[PDB]
Amino acid sequence: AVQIGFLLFPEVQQLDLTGPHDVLASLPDVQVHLIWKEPGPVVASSGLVLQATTSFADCPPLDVICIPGGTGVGALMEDPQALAFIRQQAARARYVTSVCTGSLVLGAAGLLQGKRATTHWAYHELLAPLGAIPVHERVVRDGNLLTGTGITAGIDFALTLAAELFDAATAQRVQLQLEYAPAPPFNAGSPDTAPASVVQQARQRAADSLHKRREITLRAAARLAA
Amino acid sequence: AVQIGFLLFPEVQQLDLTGPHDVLASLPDVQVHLIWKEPGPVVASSGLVLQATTSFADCPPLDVICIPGGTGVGALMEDPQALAFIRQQAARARYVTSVCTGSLVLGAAGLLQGKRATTHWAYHELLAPLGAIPVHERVVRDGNLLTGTGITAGIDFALTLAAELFDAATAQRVQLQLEYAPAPPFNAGSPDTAPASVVQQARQRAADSLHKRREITLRAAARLAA
C-alpha cells in the first residue's frame, strides 16, 4: 500500500490539504495519514476542525509527503520537531510536495537549497533567502520535489502523482469519477491577470503577514547557515 | 452577517463541502455553519473526520444553503428530518445550491419539481423521476436554485455568489488571494472528453450504486406524488 502523509497544523489553509486528500484517497492501495504531534483535533484558519490520525513518532515511512500552507506556516518555520520530521521523511520519500506557502516550510527545513521552487505570489521574495531558485510557474518540479501555487494546486498535481504511481488510465478514471473540469467565472487568479486595483487591495491586506514572515525567514536562514 | 450553511452528513464527499467552505469563509461579514442532527463528529466517505457546528433546531435562518454529494446521499434521500429542514431553509434562502449528487437530495425534498437542474454524470437519469428538467451543463441556474457538477463546482459557484452578495471586485480579490487558477494535467473530467475505455471502467464501478439509487429514487418520487 502506498503511504501518503499530509502535515496538519493549527491555522492550516484546509483546502490546500483537503483537495489532494480526497483525490488521493480515491486510489486503490493508498493509505493517507494526517500527521501532527499527537492524534486529535487541529483547527484550520477558517475555524474548520480537522483530526490528525497519527503522531510524528508513529507515522510509517511515507512514499509521498505533502506540506499545505496557511497562516500557520510562520510558527512551523521555527518548529524544530516539525522540521526534523519533514527532513527524516523527505530522505526516503519518492515525492516531496507542497501547496502555496507550504514551500516556505520546506525552505525552513533546508530542502530547497539549490532547488527550483515556487510559492504564493505575495510571499515569492522569501524563497531566495532560503536557498531556492525562485520560479514564477504554477507547478515546479526539481527531481522528486514538486511545489505548486494555488489553493487547489494539490488537486492538479495529485492527478500527476496518480499517473506516475499507477498509470495514465488510473488518473483519467479518478478525474472522470470526480467529474473534475474546473471553469472559474473570473480570471483574477494571478497578479498578471487580475486588475491592478485588485492586486493593490490584495498586496495591502498581505503586508503585515509579509513583514512578520520576512523576520521569521531571516531567523530560519540563519539556522541553515549554521 | 450573511449566514451560509452546509449540510454535513455521514459518507459525504468532503471536497464537495470543504472547497466552497474555504472560499466563502474568506469573505467579510459571513458566518458559515456545518449542520447535522447534533453538533459533533461526522465521518466523510474517505474516513476524514469533520465536526458539525449546529443542529437543525439551532441553525439560524440561512441566506445560502449548500447540499454536498457523496455516497451518503442515498440515506439522506429518505431522511424525513433532513428533508424537512432543507424545505424550511429553502423557503426563505436567497440561494439554494448543491454540488454533484447533492441535487438528488434537493430532488427528494421536492425542490426540483419543474426546475432545470444537473447532477453527477453517472446518476443524471435520476433527475427526471424527481420532477426536474435535466440539463447537461456544469452549472445550471433556475431562479434562486444553482446546481453544479464536479467535486469542485462549489469553488467556482462560490465566486459567483461572492460577486452577487458583495461585488465583482470582492470576488476577484478572493480569487487572487487564493491564487486560484486551475490547470488539470488530463482532460478526462467529462464522459464527452474521456477515452471510451475510461468511461466504461467508471460506468461499471458506479453500476451497483446506480442500481440502489434507482430503487431509492422511486420511493422518494412516490412520497412526492402523495
Author numbering:
A (entry chain A), B (entry chain A): 2 to 227
Relevant lines from the article:
Here, we address each of these questions in a study of diffuse scattering from crystalline isocyanide hydratase (ICH). We selected the ICH system because it diffracts x-rays to atomic resolution at ambient temperature, has clearly visible diffuse features in ambient temperature x-ray diffraction datasets, and displays large concerted motion of an α-helix that is modulated by the chemical state of the active site nucleophile. Upon formation of the catalytic thioimidate intermediate, this helix becomes more mobile and permits water to enter the active site and complete the reaction.
Engineered mutations at residue 150 (e.g., G150A, G150T) also favor shifted conformations of the helix to varying degrees. As expected based on these structural and space group changes, G150T ICH superimposes onto WT and G150A ICH with a larger Cα RMSD of ∼0.8 Å. In general, the CCLLM values are higher and σ values are lower for the Refmac5 anisotropic ADP models compared to those refined in PHENIX. Considered together, the improved anisotropic ADP CCLLM, the lack of change in CCBragg, the lower values of σ, and the more typical distribution of anisotropies for the Refmac5-refined and rescaled PHENIX anisotropic ADP models show that diffuse scattering data favor anisotropic ADP models that possess more plausible features even when the Bragg models have similar Rfree/Rwork and CCBragg values.
